[PDB]
């Protein structure tokens, strides 16, 4: 594997420093590092493909060095060696892709391929440099048994969920209580009602939770909260709970009332903001808890007043509601996240390839289901296969 | 400073080419594919039947392959082992290319 | 063109690995390729703007050496350095900005300044290094013919567009049938909305369909699929299609039936996801179709069997709807996306010194216009331009 | 300072470059930096820690240098090496908690701690090297004096705000007219609302108006401006301005007319768009203002009239609306945004170690609070630390 | 590529200066280009074919040279040869064939076949020659990119397109006023039709206006444009718009009246011309505009009078219009024309081999369909395809 | 005027035959014609444009000769050449547009600009080549 990295920042930069113009001097220190590989393969026969519309490319070698020394790069030296080059971009591509499809539960955080089996051999390993490459950086600090990390705009942590829980209702859906809401990738938006605007509630004020429960602990995570659930505050028809018929939501926004956030680790309290709306930081959680609660209007002008009668029919329904972005936030576990394409790379490749479902993967690598069940093999199939697919995306775009 | 390896050769299929899949440095690429060639281009039929092997107008006249044998040695001029020789292996290459 | 990069990443990896301390072998390699440059020019003059509110100021050249002699630089060695260094910034601004307002129809594409089309000059190409600017690792790539590409976040593929269709209507508008849309940047929200609740349609349910033509394609997108259209969910008094009227629309949401999003390439699905909500992959397209239906309740409650009667008026309006945003992808020409500054570097200088409006941009460099008929010269200038910003901002932010 | 950093792109350029395989020629120019470090430490003696839950750990040197020889790195090599880059890693972290503490008030934007006291020492600073990583890049250039900046993407600028204005009211809050809003990072949307339908307003039209101060100017930011507030669309039961009662909001909206937003620095217009919805350029500005006006339609369809009587109650509450959102900006001053983790590296490290509220810094580095009252003083401590925990995530996330 | 046309001029410049008897100098220059070509030939092997009624024939070389101080070519010397260049010619037109139907959409611009695929090789560069075949002359501009461009008689630019608009109707069709065209090829005929003549106009004058969209721009065109539609002069049935009935169009025609046309490149005039019949000249345009009146003759003698009564019924249908037929143009994208067999040489390959529709071109190769939707990929392909036919019919017509 | 002519099918039947990877053969006769060309120039300045919308571009002229060496065309060879091509194209095209445009009555048949009447010039006369267009 490591070897793989290599085979790249080698030829970017390498198609990259090497160009008409510049001294020898700007490349010896990377000059030989190239060479030394042409060695180590010269000779050596491969193979891959075998799955799907996958085709089955043999590659054999026999190339020279580059002894040309001369203080400026002349054109005809680029040219001479771009052509070079272009066997072995062809190549990756042909390699990446072939361990891009492979799974195994038996243990899939290792080489699979006929192809990269034969890579982790010794007589290889005389090529690893220059691993900047923030995934490698993480590869490797994994497989020596460590602390890792990673950087997300908008990670998607949630699956999709979008429910309701009615914790009062009757057959004709006209006095219900309860929340809905919409867990979805790095948002939470969730809305509680009471259609009788707690009329005959406790110190007038109705009390909601909404527990989100992280399959991946998150920290330093910047955090957007705000009051309102928009998604919510709209009519609408819903389904009911067995699926017998359809109820009816007229919401009317109030003020969430004493709003507590909580974020915390194995049960216990990491962060809390009471009220605070805006941009707060959650540390390190595995689980979010919201409260709120929905308070009566003690006063109420006229035109409110007649909203909230004291008698059925409720034909205004008092909703009190929070939404919650994570921005950002590291992980000690790959995710997909808003920015990069590591998810859409792979799942691209098998798709392209029209690669058959396998055992470790959902069919179609739907990342809801795979978040919803994310196993040890799933999470170390997706960082092999992550990290591969940055390492192509070094080369190929 | 090409391969160092010196070479190894057995008994393949001329020896002397080969050299061209893995030399890079054009010059020096053309001269191995031409002198690997020039076969003494066999067929000739002139004035009225003879079978004269003729060669290359290029050589003939065109001369230039001189012109590029020469070109190819113009850029020959590097490191490896003591200097005792270097210095006394272009210096003999230069009298050739005046 | 090239050319200009390295004039840069000279500087950058210059006035960084060059301070009072650092040892002098991490810059043996460095301070060679530099001098080589001063070298080259020397001599040379150069003529920098001449259009609208830009300064026509004068170059000449004759500057010193450095001093491999010492060891470990002494605080005197920088200040000589940024001493000249200071010439090299406060000229490179003058010469991206001034290649950075030109156009050209014909030959669009190539160096137009005075100051440039000297610099793709043969005598020049000795200064070319470190070509790891994703933007440079693209150019060159393009002037070769291969499969470029580049890395967005909400990218910006829609231009700005905010209509209805009214499939059925009739003057009163008081029984519409159709959709409304925005979409713009690299979101669209659709509504499909039936007055009547699909009473006397087939099946009760009444089909909406919402078609998008990119201008370029888009390769692996990680996009956000979800229900309903949160900006068509409230009431709105809206302009007839004739301008001559204003109709009401009073929607009461109903969840999307048998959604079906497509993702096309020339004509061919490339994806296509049924009713999956979260995030999904479309790996190639050029065209998004969304297809989803209104299905009339087959049981209601008594509150929701009022909101829709047999006959009119009809009061409450059925209105399912759609939301999918471009988390990120990859494109092969430029565009402008949410997290990169091309787009307001070019504008933003441009607007700064007054420009002109040009043969090829329009007015303002405005995205819409520009998205909505982007040509080939457009692209190729945009190509351009948004290189040079990204050259000048490896050095001025 | 400057040391400090050395001291990473030393370890990551390092515990990145230096793997079982590589030849000696890839890390030549690095083997040395390295070692020149270690003679410069070994025999002085550190200390760090004290504040709150912040352990107190002592420091001794007197490590072995590194052979300069092997051509090919024996597996032996690397391990004898991880040994010794493992007491300055976990040395490094214990150094950056510390100076990300103390807080000063006049020059509080330089060194505090025991530790970094001692490194701005004289002798120390033959350790400097590569300065690419944007942060430092930006500290030195404003040590001396210069144009500084930083890129973000969806920044923070806006303190949160939510709030109204009811330009005309009464008792009842049965006739208003007035606009609410919501600033908060780096999006802004405000509604403009009147009872009447400007039933008596000259050219039955009501101007609104919605003023944003920035508390740092923003350059080359790209905006999106689209026309209503989602947010403000939906009915609302709102307490009164002095608290002692609610009224009701129940909004039907129409499209903003005659629309202009003007981004201003000091004043002066810098740019200016009228009814231009989409993307566009704000190139340098400190304020930002948005006109727009609810135009009673002179049309009306029955169903529409029906809406806006000719005298009061009015049931149906005309409102226009906008939203902006700063997709990406520069600013010469940190700031918190949707990707970078600085603001909560630091709060997290603060939140971890118990660290007491401090002289500078508000009571959890609450974000909020910070930007509304942005000093010269926090914005140099924020700088400090940013910078700081900047240089700590090249080697622990 | 570029290597294929070689080939070629290479054969032709030779079946051709190659007889019996031609004195020896002239082909000097001739005879040393062709052996290089064998000498890097025999040895390597070709696979042709593969797919739909393609046969499969294999290939291998091993031919001697050719003699050099001879004087006058004897026949002799003729037959030995041309024995030679019939396996080439039998051999190329089995190459050509083969890659004259593949097709690829992520990189269909370049090579496919295994044929092909092995030419583009380095050890084969050793053949390119007199590129002065128009068509290769523009494939490598292209290539290198820069102002490209061919030369084409009666182009086809114009998807066909035969309709009408019925600007005021109503179901007996008895007294409309709109406009009939037909776009096909390099011509364009439109007409405007008022069967009141004017009567109830402001003015007494009818405005008419067509517009035309071309896919490509198209440069140095020279133009027939001529007043009246010959096509639409007669009388026809048609069918009605919603195709459930049929209406009669019983033309009597005037002369266009105020007769602008206006060739426009991204909305701006380039060429505008007032009523100017015979030959003009339009030198850059994407879109054509022809705006003509019908004015009722306000002086008509009494069979003129009879045909234009003040109420219905109308049974003479006023009737203006004009003709456009671009005679020749420069378009910087390979089109089909009127002299150039490059389509139909395509076209009839694919039919011949029954080869199997693709996934790039539409099936058949159908010109409207292609040149409707002419997306990069197809052009791509089509010049790819195009420039093959051209090197082929060099040798095979 | 033939002057002009020349300086073109010199170009084409130039960039034309000179690719990357050929033989010398092709163009022997080519090169020297080629060359003696640069020679003739070298030394004399030029003026174009000057009316209308036409800008006046000023040239200049010192370009090397050719490698009169190889056989097979090493793409460096291309390269240092087509960079002195692409300054005769964009100077010829600034030349043909500014003969293209200046009308005469009198002696019409004749040139005009300061740019070909100074090309008409006897000491030029040494390059006709290949008129078969
Ligand atoms: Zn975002």
Chains 1, 3, 4, 5 share one sequence.
């Not at chain 1, 990670?155 to 859906?173: D, E, G, K, V, W």
């Not at chain 1, 394409?341 to 396998?358: C, D, F, H, K």
Request: glycine share 4%.
């Amino acid at each position: 594997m490591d070897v793989l990295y290599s085979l790249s920042k080698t030829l970017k930069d390498a198609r990259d420093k090497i160009v008409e113009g510049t001294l020898y001097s700007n490349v010896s220190d990377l000059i030989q590092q190239f060479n030394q590989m042409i060695i180590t393969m010269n000779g050596n026969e491969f193979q891959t493909g075998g799955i799907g519309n996958l085709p089955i490319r043999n590659w054999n070698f026999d190339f020279g060095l580059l002894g040309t020394t001369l203080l400026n790069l002349d054109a005809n030296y680029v040219e001479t060696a771009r052509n070079t080059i272009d066997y072995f971009v062809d190549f990756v591509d042909n390699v990446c892709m072939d361990e891009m499809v492979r799974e195994s539960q038996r243990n899939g955080i290792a080489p699979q391929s006929d192809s990269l089996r034969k890579l982790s051999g010794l007589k290889f390993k005389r090529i690893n440099f220059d691993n900047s490459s923030e995934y490698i950086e993480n590869w490797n600090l994994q497989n020596r048994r460590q602390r890792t990390g990673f950087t997300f705009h908008k990670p998607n942590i949630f699956p999709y969920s979008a429910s309701f829980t009615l914790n009062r209702s009757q057959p004709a859906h006209d006095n219900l209580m309860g929340t809905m809401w919409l867990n979805a990738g790095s948002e939470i938006q969730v809305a509680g009602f009471d259609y009788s605007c707690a009329i005959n509630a406790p110190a007038n004020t109705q009390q909601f939770e909404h527990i989100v429960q992280l399959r991946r602990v998150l920290t330093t995570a910047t955090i957007t909260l705000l009051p309102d659930a928009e998604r919510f505050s709209f009519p609408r028809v819903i389904n009911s709970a067995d699926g017998a018929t359809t109820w009816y939501f007229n919401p009317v926004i109030l003020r969430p009332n004493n709003v507590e956030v909580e974020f915390l680790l194995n049960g216990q309290i990491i962060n809390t903001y009471q009220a605070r709306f805006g941009t707060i930081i959650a540390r390190n959680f595995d689980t979010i808890r919201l409260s709120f609660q929905l308070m009566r209007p003690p006063n109420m002008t006229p035109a409110v007043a007649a909203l909230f009668p004291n008698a059925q029919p409720f034909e205004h329904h008092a909703t009190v509601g929070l939404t919650l972005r994570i921005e950002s936030a590291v992980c000690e576990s790959v995710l997909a996240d808003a920015s990069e394409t590591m998810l859409a790379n792979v799942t691209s490749v098998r798709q392209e390839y029209a690669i058959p479902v396998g055992p470790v993967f959902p069919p179609g690598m739907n990342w809801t289901d795979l978040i919803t069940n994310y196993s040890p093999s799933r999470e170390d199939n997706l960082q092999r296969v992550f990290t591969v697919a940055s390492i192509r995306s070094m080369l190929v775009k | 400073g090409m391969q160092r390896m010196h070479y190894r050769n057995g008994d393949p299929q001329t020896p002397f080419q080969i050299a061209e899949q893995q030399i890079q440095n054009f010059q020096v690429a053309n001269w191995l594919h031409f002198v690997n060639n020039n076969q003494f281009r066999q067929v000739v039929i002139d004035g009225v039947l003879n079978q004269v092997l003729n060669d290359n107008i290029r050589n003939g006249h065109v001369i230039n392959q001189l012109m590029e044998a020469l070109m190819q040695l113009s850029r020959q001029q590097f490191p490896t082992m003591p200097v005792d020789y270097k210095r006394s292996i272009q210096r003999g290459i230069l009298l050739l290319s005046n």
